[PDB]
Structure 1
Amino acid sequence: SLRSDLINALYDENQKYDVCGIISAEGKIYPLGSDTKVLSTIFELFSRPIINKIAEKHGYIVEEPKQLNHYPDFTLYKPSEPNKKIAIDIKTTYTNKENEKIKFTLGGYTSFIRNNTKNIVYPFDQYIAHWIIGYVYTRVATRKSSLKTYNINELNEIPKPYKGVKVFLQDKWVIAGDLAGSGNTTNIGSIHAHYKDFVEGKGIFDSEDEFLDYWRNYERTSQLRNDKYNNISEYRNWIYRGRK
């Protein structure tokens, strides 16, 4: 399938290539910084060609946002199935010690999930699947040798700000949790668990319908959630009583 071929290719590319810097047209190389801002950027650019190659083999065209700040990162679709678009978003997080628990921010809960055409490349009802390509890396402190420029002949000598990168491919609803991933930027929170839980799909929602109803009615602050629901147990009781 498209999905199995895509995760096979991402997993393989991760295993064989290690990004180590930015390069200029003149051949000068600039080492990488330690942020997640930097590594989130690197992993998106590293995935781009892979996604395009696999999409093309299943006759899918790839469209990136035409305007800035529009989800998703990549929109796939066959011209013969305009209302069966696939949204792919790349998300990255870190780990201090290898294999500690991790969690991701899964997109806003107040934009396209509550308004069909808000901050999204195509109307939300034209997508039949929302996939997350998740990258996890173990942080590695920066040192003196990262603050100089390098030539092409010193490629393998450049120090990297990470180690043990892992990648998964999973549906957004499947790995979604019941607690916000951010406050003022109102994002959905993923489950808080080990990498294997993301791969296997051990989330808290029973269906994609339950995921959507939960986040579509989740209040923004603790003061408002106090009288409604703060977690999945409370939501299921709220539902049991008649949405009250």
Structure 2
Amino acid sequence: SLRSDLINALYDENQKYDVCGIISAEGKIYPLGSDTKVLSTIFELFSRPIINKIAEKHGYIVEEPKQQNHYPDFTLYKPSEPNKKIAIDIKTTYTNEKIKFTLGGYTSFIRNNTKNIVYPFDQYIAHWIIGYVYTRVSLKTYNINELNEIPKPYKGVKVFLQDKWVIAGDLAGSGNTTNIGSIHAHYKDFVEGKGIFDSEDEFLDYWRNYERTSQLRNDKYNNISEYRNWIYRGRK
């Protein structure tokens, strides 16, 4: 399927290549830093070609945001089927071990159908995440003839594709920027989809009603159990 083919192309591209630097039109190469801000950008760009390839093999157009305050990285849909859009978002985190990802905000497009999203939320039937996990490890320039001398910015990189709701946790991934937090698990759990939410419906209701701070949460719910109890009390 589109999914199987994409996850397949993603494992392959990852196993075959290693980004090691930025190159100029004149052949001079600058080394990559070993931090998420750099790697996230690089992992996304490394994914682009592969996502566009498979999307076309399946007849899906690929649209990236035109504006910078918008989720998702890539919007795939068939022209004949505009309300069957697929959201594919790239996320990165590192290990020195269990990982965690910040999964987007909980007060934007999930609480407002047209907020910070390329197309209205209700037009997407799936929300996938391509998660890159890298083990964290030059101030000079190099040329084409020196590609193997350039230090790589990672000890190894793994990638997985998984549905957002499936890997979502019940604890916020960030405070002031109110992001849904993923599960805090070993990469295995992400590939396998060993989440805590019973369904995508449950995941959504939870994050749509999660209070921004502990003050408010301490009288509603702070975790999955309290939420399920909150539901039993009649959503109050």
What is the CA-CA distance between 1:149 and the residue it aligns to? 0.3
Distance in 1 of aligned mates of 2:29 and 2:178: 38
CA separation in 2, counterparts of 1:151 and 1:232? Answer: 54
Partner secondary structure for residue 234 of structure 1: helix
Cα offset for 1:229? 0.2
RMSD over aligned Cα atoms: 0.7
**CA deviation after TM superposition for structure 1 residue 160, in Å:** 1.2
Q: For 1:50-109, what per-residue CA distance to the aligned partner results, in whole angstroms no more than 9, with x for missing partners? A: 0000000000000000111101000000011110000000000000xxx81000000000
CA drift at 1:133 = 0.2
1:128 aligns with 2:120: no
TM superposition shift of 1:220: 0.2
| TM-score, normalisation: structure 2 | 0.99
- Structure 1 CA distance, aligned partners of 2:57 and 2:225? 43
State the alpha-carbon separation in 2 of the partners of residues 129 and 84 from structure 1. Answer: 8
Tell me how far apart the structure 2 counterparts of residues 203 and 147 of structure 1 sit (CA, whole Å).
Answer: 42
C-alpha distance in 1 between matches for 2:112 and 2:231: 23
Residues 119-147 of structure 1, C-alpha deviation per residue, up to 9 Å, x if partnerless?
0000110000000000000000xxxxx11
1:23-53 Cα shifts (integer Å, max 9, x gaps): 0000000000111000001000000000000
User: Which residue pairs with 2:75 in the alignment?
Assistant: 75
Secondary structure of the 1:237 match is helix
Q: Give runs of aligned pairs for residues 2-41 of structure 1, distance below 5 A.
A: 2-41=2-41
User: Does the residue aligned with 2:81 lie in a helix, a strand or coil?
Assistant: coil
Q: Distance in 2 between matches of 1:234 and 1:65?
A: 37
Moved more, 36-45 or 152-161: 152-161
| Deviation at residue 170 of structure 1 after TM alignment | 0.3
Residue aligned with 1:90, SS: strand
Alpha-carbon deviation of 1:161?
1.9
Aligned-pair CA distance for 1:196? 0.4
Q: 1:18: Cα distance to partner? A: 0.3
**Equivalent-residue separation in structure 2 for 1:164 and 1:23 (angstroms):** 22
Within the candidate set 174, 177, 198, 2:169 is matched to 177
Q: Shift of residue 241 of structure 1?
A: 1.4
Distance in 1 between the 2:224 and 2:156 partners?
33
Structure 1 runs not aligned, ≥5 long? 141-145
**1:184-219 deviations in whole A, cap 9, x for unaligned?**
000000000000000000011000000000000000
Give CA deviations for 1:147-177 in whole Å, capped at 9, x if unaligned: 1100000001110121110000000000000
Q: Secondary structure at the match of 1:29?
A: strand
Distance in structure 1 (CA, Å) of the matches to 2:30 and 2:206: 45
SS of equivalent to 1:83: strand
Offset, 1:240: 1.2
- Tell me how far apart the structure 2 counterparts of residues 83 and 41 of structure 1 sit (CA, whole Å): 29
Distance 1:108 1:184 in 2: 10
The alignment partner of 1:188 has SS state of strand
Give, in whole Å, the separation in 2 of the partners of 1:164 and 1:14.
Answer: 10
Distance apart, 1:228 and its partner CA: 0.3
**Which residues of structure 2 form unaligned runs of 5+?**
none
Give the Å deviation of 1:8. 0.3
